[PDB]
Amino acid sequence: TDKVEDFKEDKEKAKEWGKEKEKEWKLTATEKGKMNNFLDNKNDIKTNYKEITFSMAGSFEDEIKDLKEIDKMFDKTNLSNSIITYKNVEPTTIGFNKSLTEGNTINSDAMAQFKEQFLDRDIKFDSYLDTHLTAQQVSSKERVILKVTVPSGKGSTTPTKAGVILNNSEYKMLIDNGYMVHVDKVSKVVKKGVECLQIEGTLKKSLDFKNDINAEAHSWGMKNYEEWAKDLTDSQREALDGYARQDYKEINNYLRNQGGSGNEKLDAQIKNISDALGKKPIPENITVYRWCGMPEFGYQISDPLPSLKDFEEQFLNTIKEDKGYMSTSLSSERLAAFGSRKIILRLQVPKGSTGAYLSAIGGFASEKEILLDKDSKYHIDKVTEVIIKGVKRYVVDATLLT
């Protein structure tokens, strides 16, 4: 068990620790101003953040300027010690869409559903995770207590991108978007006679470029796959170029529709593609995106988006698979070509997954593209909503199986 601080309910001891750690981030006065403006929802930038990250280029440009600077602040972090932080949240904020409470008590069936959905899995948040240095008083609706261990990563190759900031007269821990909370334990606790569900978790790194406002996605892709593309054999290179140029249409139709039949021509190319995609496993945990049409989720084009309840009953905690190759992007930016689709897949691709940064081969390859090998399967973790231009869309969080 690593050395970890935990002030529990002692605000005074926590304030002293906070005062000294706040100095270590070394943000300028201008930087602190922008970060606090975000946390205080100035001009509704915090309320609009989720939509912004799934918006088309050019939208919310004043907010984007601020978000670009904030993103850069996390590259200036230097967390000196690990600590347990606290944050109370309303259940729907983390995708639990069933009734959780009955006054000051927790529904018995609710806990069972909650544990089945979250225990031993990772929770992906929509925005920067701002946590407290001590246990917080419970309100009526924020009945889920997040007790999150924030490792410093001090003597490692990946120090944690988190830091302490003074906001609203309190020292708080700000954690970058590139982290999920792995749920280690779920239990019912009582605070002042009010029952709450406590999640004890630990940060788990996963790169997430969102709508790539600082143009870092492609550089990551090239840094990790430029060598891969260079070492592709002639047949593999030929097969991948064809695929991207126009062969993907026929190839995936072949696979997804009575695949592996009689056609040595496609079988040969498919072999070359899958061999290339297996040469370099995804080097680290990453987040990828895919805008999906209704048919991809078994609905018709004329059907309205089903209620959240019916959508979960059909997909929550199920495994979705594809015999063809699944194209995804490091960016969640909305493009005109598919900006009308109602279902957005936010997929966790674990280190070791079978795929590659296809964009490293140039040519007809798509922008910031990660191509996953055929026969992919992913577990649907949770479903949440986002209103883009006054229209509701469902964001489907899932994890790729390796």
Outline the structure in words.
The chain is of the alpha+beta class and 402 residues long. The chain has two domains: 3-205, Toxin ADP-ribosyltransferase, Chain A, domain 1; 206-402, Alpha-Beta Complex (Toxin ADP-ribosyltransferase, Chain A, domain 1). The chain has helices spanning 11-25, 29-39, 45-53, 61-73, 108-118, 217-230, 234-256, 264-277, 308-315, and strands at 83-89, 101-102, 105-106, 122-123, 129-132, 144-150, 162-167, 170-175, 179-191, 194-205, 286-292, 319-322, 326-329, 343-349, 355-357, 369-372, 376-388, 391-400. It has a five-stranded mixed beta sheet with strand order 1-6-10-9-4. The longest helix is centred in the middle third of the chain and has 23 residues, at 234-256. The protein is globular.
What layout of secondary structure does this protein have?
Elements: H1 11-25, H2 29-39, H3 45-53, H4 61-73, E1 83-89, E2 101-102, E3 105-106, H5 108-118, E4 122-123, E5 129-132, E6 144-150, E7 162-167, E8 170-175, E9 179-191, E10 194-205, H6 217-230, H7 234-256, H8 264-277, E11 286-292, H9 308-315, E12 319-322, E13 326-329, E14 343-349, E15 355-357, E16 369-372, E17 376-388, E18 391-400
Parallel strand pairs: 6-10, 14-18
Antiparallel strand pairs: 1-6, 2-3, 4-9, 5-8, 7-8, 9-10, 11-14, 12-17, 13-16, 15-16, 17-18
